[PDB]
Design a protein around this ligand. Structure first.
Ligand SMILES: Cc1cccc(/C=N/c2ccccc2/N=C/c2cccc(C)c2O)c1O
Ligand SMILES: [Fe+3]
Length: 154
């Protein structure tokens, strides 16, 4: 995977917008994920009992997790591919502690793209979506590499 500097700038430009409302984007993304793929909700004992979108929107645990996810992802994206230091811990944790399959990472990537488009349609066009897709694909491929290294067939 390789993005042009221009593509990385499209990614960082839209992320600056995500940063103006991290919690809101986080909620939208996780709600999208849980509604699109209900099985992923089973991984959170703290709010796996959430059912309606109203319950999800009112959940402090869901909101907090969305902030954790986007804060971590933002740190990785800003490295423009040179994210070994930030990605290693995330990978090991997801493989040995959380046991998150690669397919789940694919699902959340879909949700991220969808929400960014929904909230920033005037700027998150085909070029930016393509760039973010490549960025998240690189992210997933590098996580998969760490997984395989530790024997976790996620
Ligand atoms: C993508 C991403 C970027 C930055 C940080 C994270 C943090 N993930 C977690 C942190 C603590 C505990 C659990 C985490 N992830 C759980 C999880 C559950 C279902 C589906 C997916 C897909 C998950 O990553 C993250 O998942
Ligand atoms: Fe996670």
């Amino acid at each position: 995977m390789v993005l042009s500097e221009g593509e990385w700038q499209l990614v960082l430009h839209v992320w600056a917008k995500v940063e103006a409302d991290v919690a809101g984007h986080g909620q939208d993304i996780l709600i999208r994920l849980f509604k699109s793929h209900p099985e992923t909700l089973e991984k959170f004992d703290r709010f796996k009992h959430l059912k309606t979108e109203a319950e999800m929107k009112a959940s402090e645990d869901l909101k907090k997790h969305g902030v954790t996810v986007l804060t971590g992802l933002g740190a990785i994206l800003k490295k423009k591919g040179h994210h070994e230091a930030e990605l290693k811990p995330l990978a090991q944790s997801h493989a040995t502690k959380h046991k998150i399959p690669i397919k789940y990472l694919e699902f959340i990537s879909e949700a991220i793209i969808h929400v960014l488009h929904s909230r920033h349609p005037g700027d998150f066009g085909a070029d930016a979506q393509g760039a973010m897709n490549k960025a998240l694909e690189l992210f997933r491929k590098d996580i998969a590499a760490k997984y395989k290294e530790l024997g976790y067939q996620g």
